[PDB]
Design an enzyme around this catalytic site. Structure first.
Site, PDB file in Angstrom:
ATOM      1  N   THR B  31       0.878  -1.199   0.000  1.00 19.58           N
ATOM      2  CA  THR B  31       0.000   0.000   0.000  1.00 19.58           C
ATOM      3  C   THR B  31       0.917   1.251   0.000  1.00 19.58           C
ATOM      4  O   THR B  31       0.545   2.356  -0.427  1.00 19.58           O
ATOM      5  CB  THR B  31      -0.852   0.052   1.313  1.00 19.58           C
ATOM      6  OG1 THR B  31      -1.453  -1.242   1.579  1.00 19.58           O
ATOM      7  CG2 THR B  31      -1.921   1.147   1.244  1.00 19.58           C
ATOM      8  N   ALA B  91       0.169  -1.975   7.581  1.00 19.55           N
ATOM      9  CA  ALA B  91      -0.094  -2.754   8.789  1.00 19.55           C
ATOM     10  C   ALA B  91      -0.926  -3.949   8.381  1.00 19.55           C
ATOM     11  O   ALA B  91      -1.709  -3.874   7.410  1.00 19.55           O
ATOM     12  CB  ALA B  91      -0.839  -1.910   9.846  1.00 19.55           C
ATOM     13  N   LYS B 102       2.040  -6.112  12.609  1.00 15.28           N
ATOM     14  CA  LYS B 102       2.829  -6.010  11.375  1.00 15.28           C
ATOM     15  C   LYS B 102       3.721  -7.248  11.225  1.00 15.28           C
ATOM     16  O   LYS B 102       3.895  -7.985  12.173  1.00 15.28           O
ATOM     17  CB  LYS B 102       3.672  -4.720  11.379  1.00 15.28           C
ATOM     18  CG  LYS B 102       2.808  -3.421  11.124  1.00 15.28           C
ATOM     19  CD  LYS B 102       3.667  -2.120  11.127  1.00 15.28           C
ATOM     20  CE  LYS B 102       4.830  -2.076  10.100  1.00 15.28           C
ATOM     21  NZ  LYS B 102       4.437  -2.379   8.676  1.00 15.28           N
ATOM     22  N   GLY B 105       4.792  -9.519   5.840  1.00 15.37           N
ATOM     23  CA  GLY B 105       5.924  -9.695   4.868  1.00 15.37           C
ATOM     24  C   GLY B 105       7.306 -10.050   5.444  1.00 15.37           C
ATOM     25  O   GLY B 105       8.316 -10.065   4.717  1.00 15.37           O
ATOM     26  N   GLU B 111      11.148  -2.490   9.895  1.00 17.33           N
ATOM     27  CA  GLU B 111       9.941  -1.651   9.977  1.00 17.33           C
ATOM     28  C   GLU B 111       9.819  -0.941  11.333  1.00 17.33           C
ATOM     29  O   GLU B 111       9.529   0.299  11.403  1.00 17.33           O
ATOM     30  CB  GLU B 111       8.685  -2.474   9.678  1.00 17.33           C
ATOM     31  CG  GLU B 111       8.533  -2.809   8.212  1.00 17.33           C
ATOM     32  CD  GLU B 111       7.533  -3.878   7.941  1.00 17.33           C
ATOM     33  OE1 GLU B 111       7.026  -4.477   8.908  1.00 17.33           O
ATOM     34  OE2 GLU B 111       7.240  -4.119   6.741  1.00 17.33           O
TER      35      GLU B 111
END
Lengths: 246, 246, 246, 246
Positions: B31, B91, B102, B105, B111
């Site tokens: 996103t 998120a 989170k 991935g 992050e």
């Protein structure tokens, strides 16, 4: 899955020598499942339990380590057992000279360390793995190449510019992991399409000499036989010198 | 994809302060694509090119590093730029108090290193990420937990036995990689289902204190706002103190 | 070396229970040398050979793995043997409550994974390791802290700014390696001087909660006894509740 | 230190072309210190500040990264800047044909990735590095070889058995780290004594083709010049085709 198991049981039964073999390489296959299964079965047999109890099984990474333990076989390390008696593994493609493409599961390094440490190396696969002639015929995704992570630009440049690769991608991790696959040895994987490979021995050496290249998915003059399962229950065998039989 | 881009452009336009902000955290989102895109667009604008030319963008791993470069933004490292002005990221789920899950991935560590180094942290997501109340409501796959690889048995045992996890799996790499996912920091990932989490702050501390745990996918008291895209083009915003608006 | 061996033989003889103990943790000591040696000696004894043959020894990294093999003991992995019966290891300093500083050899992580997986943990050291009262009295080099490599600036900042460390350095590799030490788990090491530490339990938790921190060299409520060798051949023992004897 | 700085300033002054060169490789030397220093000095010069401001410096690991930043030079990555204009680095030994042994600091991989990505490669050293004729004359510690960690037994076996190495050791980390050195690329280092090496080009290829070998400390047909500092302030230069001068 049908075909996969057929090949595996014949490979073990015909090649595992309970009198000679103690250190056994177990590969990272989805076909090897049935190799470890077969070996495990001999351990459940009162006739072979005592000899099979003493087998030490050397893994080619995590699924392999798992297949060994889950089949109740003794687990050893290649460092402690560097001279392997016999190794079994899968392949992504096999050519008429029993040269292999491996590394579809990103475990090519420890697969090769094990298989080239073995007196005898046996491949087990389903029939789709058997090329009409050349590597790169039905496996279209490229030769997997393990590389030092900082080198992925350089290696891609060399593969395209020096070795005339047709397509070069750093393998990404899909939904499980954003960005590049990291191997069990903390490396990246490049999948390099070279089309159909007429001289895999020459190709392997050229890639292996590159700065950034750790190891290639080209297994050369290593496999002594390959067993191929058909759905129809039948099993074809390729041996050295272009000799093939059912 | 529709919804994803909507949220991203509003998040940047409303929160990126061209007068105040120079060091920008860019997250590992699917996103965020549209965050980096939006920022890139300002650089293509003669009005903002000079100021946006000087932005230094800090990545949260490889896709992120890629999104920055491909959008022609300057790429910095967190080590050289440890004080980040503003960070944007996705998120897997957001609760009513802007606590986050989170790590879907496998990039949760970098992050969090980035987002907790930022004065302001903004989440951008599609509306499915917005829980009716608690973390673990619609994201059913577990809290991602990054762990030292030798510890996966111990950590699984502790999560089940001490913390009463409902389900614990070491994430596997799917077709891209046989066996466990290895992260950009050479670690494994456990996905641990704790059901709906009523005290994520307490849960995070308990997991973080475990032997083998590197970092958790629970981002606590970090996000100041979250933007959620709807397909219908609309964008909802959650802020601190249960305040929400369109 | 004199003192080191004295402590080790008493530690094993008094605590290794041939009837109860099968899974033995062997630490990364330069004093443990004599622990592995002692255990090896029992295997050379016709009285104990059969029982000691069956011991499985769990290493805390490479010297440890080596000490096991070179003493002809069976080598296991913590993943396969997660419940350890008894572990022996060294320490960089021991306080009056048997709290430890460890990690002088950069192996603190696997040392702690093993020692905290053990029913009983025994420390073996020379007498210089025994602090008059507090950790940080005679070991002046800092608490070793294993960290994710990208986090070394952040962690240093937090240790100084939040935890008021007196001195913080990323350990360098000396003549063997230019730049930072990399551990067996692919991490960096920070050595953080906190002076004399009056509440090591509190200190450990604070460091462990930091973003970037993998594990600390503070071993808390883990050791049940510590044996200290003197040059003069004598051996002092510290036990729980401030009880000490020769 | 005297000699080291002498060589460095001449190397930069004579070879760094402010009109042509923008991407500069900075090596892992203890002699390069004075290369980065010299380059930094040009940036403090109002005459060159504007051009030197725009230099992008590519590191060969952590000391190198540090030398760049501490000299206030712009820091780039080899991945973003793969075509390097000029690189400077040290050497453990240089032969009459400007073949090098490197890797005494365990950074040979990123040193070679950088130096072989450069149009021009310049070595800077003190005079002790200049062999009367062959590599392996005064550097007696072996060719450093970076290897995959699981392969250290295999690689040692091959080096001894196939390549007839005189001595092979896995480098240990000394007081900074118990057990094997781990490199910045998560690998081990073997130091392999081959005596005086008459055909380093042949030797490099043989080692590089081995299973487990990542890269060798043999830098072949790479260096275009080498500068050697004497204590007495003088500087000797070796160039291609056996040409040498003061």
């Amino acid at each position: 899955e049908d075909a996969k198991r057929a090949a595996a049981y014949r490979a073990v039964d015909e090649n595992l020598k309970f009198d000679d073999h103690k250190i056994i390489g177990i590969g990272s296959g989805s076909t090897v499942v049935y190799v470890a299964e077969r070996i495990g079965q001999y351990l459940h047999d009162p006739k072979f339990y005592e000899v099979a109890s003493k087998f030490i099984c050397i893994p080619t990474g995590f699924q392999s380590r798992n297949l060994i333990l889950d089949n109740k076989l003794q687990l050893g390390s290649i460092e402690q057992y560097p001279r392997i008696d016999i190794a079994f593994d899968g392949a992504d493609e096999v050519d008429e000279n029993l040269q292999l493409i491996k590394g579809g599961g990103a475990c090519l390094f420890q697969e090769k360390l094990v298989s080239t440490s073995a007196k005898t190396f046996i491949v087990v696969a389903d029939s789709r793995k058997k090329s009409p002639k050349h590597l790169g015929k039905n496996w279209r995704q490229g030769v997997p190449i393990e590389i030092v992570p900082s080198s992925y630009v350089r290696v891609k440049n060399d593969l395209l510019e020096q070795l005339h690769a047709e397509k070069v991608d750093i393998r990404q991790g899909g939904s499980a992991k954003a960005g590049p696959v990291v191997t069990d040895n903390n490396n990246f994987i490049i999948d390099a399409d070279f089309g159909e490979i007429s001289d895999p021995r020459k190709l392997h050496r050229e890639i292996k000499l590159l700065v950034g290249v750790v190891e290639t998915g080209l297994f050369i003059d290593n496999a002594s036989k390959a067993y191929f399962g058909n759905s129809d229950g039948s099993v074809e065998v390729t041996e050295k010198h272009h000799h093939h039989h059912h």
